[PDB]
Structure formats: structure tokens, C-alpha cells
Design a protein around this ligand. Structure first.
Ligand SMILES: [Zn+2]
Ligand SMILES: [Zn+2]
Ligand SMILES: [Zn+2]
Ligand SMILES: [Zn+2]
Ligand SMILES: [Zn+2]
Ligand SMILES: [Zn+2]
Ligand SMILES: [Zn+2]
Ligand SMILES: [Zn+2]
Ligand SMILES: [Zn+2]
Ligand SMILES: [Zn+2]
Ligand SMILES: [Zn+2]
Length: 474
């Protein structure tokens, strides 16, 4: 007999096909059958009439590396329907690195002495011993490797350092990491050459993972940054994933037409993927960057002046008698939200066929960007239902089947017999993001229940206590 059947709802199976009325039966951690299951014995037959049963949402872009250890409930994500998170993005991974003062933006994962894992395998073992509520597909970050190997980061790596980093990256992949990410836009890796990146990532073709990247520039020189990314993909001969695609800065508004055309052309000759979050503001370390600081900038957290969390940088700067750009150093380390994107570009990028959905939530932030709590329902409700940017089955595919395919997560992302029972039951008419910039932690509406490996993790708007997540391998 099945453990339970979710009966009477509409199944949107993750393959980009219109929903159809069908029951979903689960036995243990697997979807046992899909269709009219009235004749199948089940210990429970749960009525979900009026709801949609879809695969669990896969968060293609997270910084949940440490949150998975400190807050196993993973409420910001499971409350949105997320069942799997991809970690270690933008060259930022929690492991391998033993340092009590890692360089920004690595501090985005730190809760104080969190960087204690000398080997990537030790990190994966900690997750397996005390599993989080969601599955974790983990990448190792090139900036973390630089911090672990290089005494001085303000220069290109020597052959010896490249070899040491490559050795760590190879060990991580062998241990279960699903790829390697970079973020040369940031200080720890700004001096890294394309050659250094390519050689450190050679283990990918051997162990079979993806190369994920926060491109070197996402504004005026985004074309050069895209070309560097495509070149790396060709030299390594592995799939590349472009993180949080956007065009930033007033002088670049509208250029998503140009960037998407370049990505589409590249996809015709090499393996390219991309993800994006559904908002017009980004968030990361507070940084002296003329473009990031050009628009409205809010502080998410601040070490030297904790009381500044939630404040407007323009006001802080004015009252300190300095420009926004000049006041930054005295406030570091800190985090911020930057309003430097345009709605038309965000919509174009989201609608572009291949674009997968990633929240880019920064879970440790005192006053976070709302994407942490509202990304997936914002795509299903606001964009699909209310704006008609894409039909619901395509919105679902963009956070399930497409993502599982690009990251190589076998037997996940689709409501198919034999696949893992990572599922979401949501109300299509009411699903919606509730989090706003003013109240960034409000729980999404319309998310009835969430299952991970067959176990309910979210029910009655609360974590069930089921730590059902698993460390995944590509
Ligand atoms: Zn915490
Ligand atoms: Zn190896
Ligand atoms: Zn080389
Ligand atoms: Zn990034
Ligand atoms: Zn090839
Ligand atoms: Zn401006
Ligand atoms: Zn004031
Ligand atoms: Zn000056
Ligand atoms: Zn990110
Ligand atoms: Zn709306
Ligand atoms: Zn538990």
C-alpha cells in the first residue's frame, strides 16, 4: 500500500505541460504512481481538490551553506515550497576554510567562527549527521579556495597556488560537490586571471560538475564578462551557469535585449544556463562601487555600527558629511540592498525561456532583501498569474524540471513514478509573495504543504519537525 495519496488536485508535473487532474501516490521517499489512484490501497487519502500538486521547488541560487547547519528547519525556504537548495555560489562556499575573519563577501555566510571546516568532506558529513529540512546540492567556491591557499589575494596565483586550489577543488568534487563557482567581481578574486580560474576548475570535466559564475562585471563591461564566461566553458568543456543575470545601472537599462541575444547564440554551440531572482534590487556586501551605489541603497547589517541596519545609506552619508561612495569604508564590513535594476529587464530575463529561478537569499542578514522569503511565490503568483508573463506550468518548470536537468539532480524535479517525492501543494489562485522591502520576512500565501523525500516538512504554516533533507550528488 502507498503511505498516502494526494487526491483530487491538478498535477503540474514539472515537464512544462498544462496541468491535469490526477492523484499522486507516495511510498516511502518515492512517487509510486500518478493518475486516477482510487483503486490503489493507501494508508491516507489526503484531499487536495482546488490545489496544484507540483514537484518541490529547487532553489538554483542560494547562500544557505551555513544556514543549513545553524537553522535546520530552513523556514525561509520551505515556507515558499523549496525542497532543494544549490549552495556555494559566486565563489563563496563555507568550506574548505578555517579562518576566524574570512574576507568579504565570505562573511555573508558567517555567524561568528562558522568557517571551521578544513576539508569539504567534513562539511558534507556535518550535513549528513544532522540533516536540514531540504536537500542540499553543494558547490565549492573559488574565492574560498583562494582564501585557503593564498597568503596575499591582491595578485594572480602562482602555479603552486593554482595546483593547491585545484587539489582542494578536486577533493571537494570527489566528496560530493556538484560544481565549482567563481565571483571575480569580488575583492578576494578580482586579481584572478581567466587562466587561474580555468586551471583550478579542471576537475569538473573529470568528476562531471557545473561551472557556476557571478560574472566579473554585470554593467558597462557585461559583454566582456559574458565572453570570458563562454570562453571558460569552451576551454573546460563543461556546462556553465550564469548566476543572477541582470544588467545593472541606469546606463545599462534595456541591455537585457543584447545580453539575452548573446546568451541565446552561445547556447547554440555550447552548454549554457542562467538563473535570476524576480526583483529590481540586488543585495550583497556593502562595497565601494560607483554603479552599485548609484541608486537607493539600504543597509542590511553593519559590524562597526549595528544600529545602522535598515537605514538608508544616502542619509547616513549626508549626516556624516560625505558622499555615499566615500562613507563606505568606515561602515565596513556591512551588507546592503541596491536598487540598480529596471523592471522591464527583470521581466525580459525571467521570461527568456532557459532562465531558472534562484532566490539569492542572504539568510544571515539582520534586515534581509525580501527575495529570501518571497522569490518562488512571486514568480507563481505575481508574475505568472497576475501579469501573465508565462503560463503556470512554465513558471513551475522554471523552478523544477529545468533546474533539476541543468544541475544534474537525478530523479528530482518532476512528478513522475519512480522519482523522489519532493512535492508542493499550493493554491494557484492565492499563491503569493508576502515579503516586501519593509517587511522582508513575511511568509508566503497559498503554500499548503511541502514534502521532501516523502516526508511533510511544511504543514499548517509551520515546520513539522521532519529533517528529511539529503546531501545530493550529481
Ligand atoms: Zn542564526
Ligand atoms: Zn579527483
Ligand atoms: Zn592554462
Ligand atoms: Zn553573486
Ligand atoms: Zn566539447
Ligand atoms: Zn543614477
Ligand atoms: Zn537623519
Ligand atoms: Zn575625492
Ligand atoms: Zn548570490
Ligand atoms: Zn502582483
Ligand atoms: Zn530532527
Amino acid at each position: 500500500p502507498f503511505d498516502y495519496i494526494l487526491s483530487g488536485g491538478t498535477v503540474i508535473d514539472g515537464t512544462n505541460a498544462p496541468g491535469r487532474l490526477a492523484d499522486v501516490g507516495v511510498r516511502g521517499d518515492r512517487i509510486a504512481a500518478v493518475g486516477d489512484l482510487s483503486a490503489s490501497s493507501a494508508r491516507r487519502r489526503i484531499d487536495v481538490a482546488g490545489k496544484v500538486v507540483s514537484p518541490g521547488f529547487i532553489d538554483s541560487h542560494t547562500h544557505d551553506d551555513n544556514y543549513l547547519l545553524k537553522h535546520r528547519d530552513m523556514t525561509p525556504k520551505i515556507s515558499q515550497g523549496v525542497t532543494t537548495v544549490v549552495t556555494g555560489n559566486c565563489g563563496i562556499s563555507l568550506a574548505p576554510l578555517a579562518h576566524a575573519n574570512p574576507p568579504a563577501p565570505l562573511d555573508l555566510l558567517d555567524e561568528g567562527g562558522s568557517f571551521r571546516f578544513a576539508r569539504f568532506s567534513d562539511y558534507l558529513e556535518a550535513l549528513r549527521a544532522a540533516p536540514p529540512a531540504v536537500n542540499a546540492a553543494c558547490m565549492v567556491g573559488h574565492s574560498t579556495l583562494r582564501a585557503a591557499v593564498m597568503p596575499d589575494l591582491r595578485r594572480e596565483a602562482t602555479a603552486d597556488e593554482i595546483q593547491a586550489m585545484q587539489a582542494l577543488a578536486d577533493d571537494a568534487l570527489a566528496s560530493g560537490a556538484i560544481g565549482i563557482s567563481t565571483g571575480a567581481f569580488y575583492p578576494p578574486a578580482a586579481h584572478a586571471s581567466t587562466e587561474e580560474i580555468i586551471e583550478v576548475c579542471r576537475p569538473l570535466i573529470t568528476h562531471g560538475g557545473v561551472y557556476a559564475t557571478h560574472m566579473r562585471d554585470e554593467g558597462e563591461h557585461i559583454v566582456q564578462a559574458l565572453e570570458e564566461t563562454f570562453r571558460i566553458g569552451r576551454e573546460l568543456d563543461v556546462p556553465v551557469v550564469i548566476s543572477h543575470h541582470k544588467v545593472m545601472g541606469k546606463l545599462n537599462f534595456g541591455r537585457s535585449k543584447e545580453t539575452l541575444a548573446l546568451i541565446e547564440a552561445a547556447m547554440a554551440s555550447q552548454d549554457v544556463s542562467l538563473d535570476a531572482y524576480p526583483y529590481v534590487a540586488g543585495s550583497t556586501m556593502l562595497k565601494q562601487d560607483r554603479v552599485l551605489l548609484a541608486g537607493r541603497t539600504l543597509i542590511t547589517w553593519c559590524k562597526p555600527y549595528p544600529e545602522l541596519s535598515g537605514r538608508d545609506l544616502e542619509e547616513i552619508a549626508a549626516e556624516r558629511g560625505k558622499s555615499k561612495y566615500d562613507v563606505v569604508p568606515e561602515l565596513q564590513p556591512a551588507g546592503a540592498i541596491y536598487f540598480m535594476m529596471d523592471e522591464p529587464d527583470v521581466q525580459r530575463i525571467l521570461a527568456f525561456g532557459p532562465t531558472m529561478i534562484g532566490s539569492d537569499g542572504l539568510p544571515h542578514d539582520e534586515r534581509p532583501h525580501p527575495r529570501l522569503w518571497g522569490t518562488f511565490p512571486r514568480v507563481l503568483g505575481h508574475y505568472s498569474r497576475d501579469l501573465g508573463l508565462f503560463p503556470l506550468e512554465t513558471a513551475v518548470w522554471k523552478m523544477t524540471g529545468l533546474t533539476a536537468a541543468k544541475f544534474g539532480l537525478a530523479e528530482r524535479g518532476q512528478v513522475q513514478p519512480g522519482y523522489y517525492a519532493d512535492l508542493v501543494v499550493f493554491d494557484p489562485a492565492t499563491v503569493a509573495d508576502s515579503a516586501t522591502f519593509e517587511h522582508p520576512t513575511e511568509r508566503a500565501a497559498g503554500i499548503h504543504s511541502v514534502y521532501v523525500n516523502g516526508a511533510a516538512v511544511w504543514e499548517d504554516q509551520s515546520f513539522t519537525g521532519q529533517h528529511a533533507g539529503r546531501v545530493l550528488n550529481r
